[PDB]
Amino acid sequence: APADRLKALVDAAVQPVMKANDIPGLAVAISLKGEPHYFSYGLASKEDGRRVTPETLFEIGSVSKTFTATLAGYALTQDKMRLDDRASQHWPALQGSRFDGISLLDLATYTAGGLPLQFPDSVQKDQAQIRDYYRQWQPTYAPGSQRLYSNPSIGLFGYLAARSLGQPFERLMEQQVFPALGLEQTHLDVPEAALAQYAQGYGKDDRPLRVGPGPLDAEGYGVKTSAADLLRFVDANLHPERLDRPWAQALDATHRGYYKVGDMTQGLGWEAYDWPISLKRLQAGNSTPMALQPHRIARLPAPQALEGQRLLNKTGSTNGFGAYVAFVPGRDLGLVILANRNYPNAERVKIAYAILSGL
Numbered sequence: 001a002p003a004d005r006l007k008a009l010v011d012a013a014v015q016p017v018m019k020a021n022d023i024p025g026l027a028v029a030i031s032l033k034g035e036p037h038y039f040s041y042g043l044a045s046k047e048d049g050r051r052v053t054p055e056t057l058f059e060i061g062s063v064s065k066t067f068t069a070t071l072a073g074y075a076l077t078q079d080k081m082r083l084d085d086r087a088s089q090h091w092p093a094l095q096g097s098r099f100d101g102i103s104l105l106d107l108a109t110y111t112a113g114g115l116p117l118q119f120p121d122s123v124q125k126d127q128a129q130i131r132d133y134y135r136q137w138q139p140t141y142a143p144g145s146q147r148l149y150s151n152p153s154i155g156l157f158g159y160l161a162a163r164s165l166g167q168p169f170e171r172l173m174e175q176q177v178f179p180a181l182g183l184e185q186t187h188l189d190v191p192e193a194a195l196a197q198y199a200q201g202y203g204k205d206d207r208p209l210r211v212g213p214g215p216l217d218a219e220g221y222g223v224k225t226s227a228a229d230l231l232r233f234v235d236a237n238l239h240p241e242r243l244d245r246p247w248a249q250a251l252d253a254t255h256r257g258y259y260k261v262g263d264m265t266q267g268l269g270w271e272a273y274d275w276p277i278s279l280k281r282l283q284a285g286n287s288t289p290m291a292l293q294p295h296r297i298a299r300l301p302a303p304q305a306l307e308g309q310r311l312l313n314k315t316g317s318t319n320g321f322g323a324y325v326a327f328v329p330g331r332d333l334g335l336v337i338l339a340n341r342n343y344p345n346a347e348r349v350k351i352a353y354a355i356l357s358g359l
């Protein structure tokens, strides 16, 4: 039986990785041939016995950047900004700073010249502190040359895209983006009425960990969502034509590659690979040196469509959570894996590869 085989395949991929990484709870959602399939494992909260379901809310961390990218794709379809705009076009406080010579594309794709992984601990979630950080920042190397994965970089991209639309980022997400995408279980600021769905996150010694405030957190890493809503988002990415045209175009803008580093082609939010490709290679593209070290880019002569025989993915983590999303445009296949422990990206990719190989 097909439901027995699919359950066996997903269980075989998930169960050992959960044990091995001591993951309390994990939700899988798969889109296959136009149909959704959900597999829920373990506990959302150990202390109260609450089980994971497809409606449990997880922190997705940097997977949030794919939503940020979608907002920016909406601003672009509306002609409120262009990728080649200088960042300081969209924020007068930045005029006269080094952001006069940095494009929005450079910010979105981590090539502004060495913006760091995180804001320094000296910058708190405070508009003035953020402003002053960017005013004073100077590149380590020429913009457009080297990829250094960076929350302040894409954070500023999303902040400027929201400025270009004339409204705060978080308001635009709640009022316009999430409703356009059909997402009612997707939040930047979880409502009190939805808190009972919010899983606990677990760290060292099972310390409980839910993400706290930080500068440009919404734009970099602040979405909480369920496996079912995140799979709805993947299905919108698999079929943008099913949305009203401005939002189809906003999604398409996230399916354009600008350069390569190793096996990976960098889009807005999404990172792409040829498919098939080995597990080792997909793990290496999602490895610690990719998150932490600069890499010289191989720029494409024109943007490349991230479609067909490709896998598009994004990892994300918070202190307490570990998420992974992947889909294969040319096969109508999508997958979401959400967990309440931050466990290594290689292990997330191991689960996903086993599932996608078996589908």
Ligand SMILES: *C(=O)N1C[C@H](NOS(=O)(=O)O)CC[C@H]1C(N)=O
Binding pocket: 060, 061, 062, 063, 149, 151, 221, 286, 291, 315, 316, 317, 318, 345
């Ligand atoms: C993304 O979740 N954040 C940014 C950065 N990206 O790397 S990732 O998804 O390989 O995990 C480091 C992890 C994470 C964060 N802000 O800690």
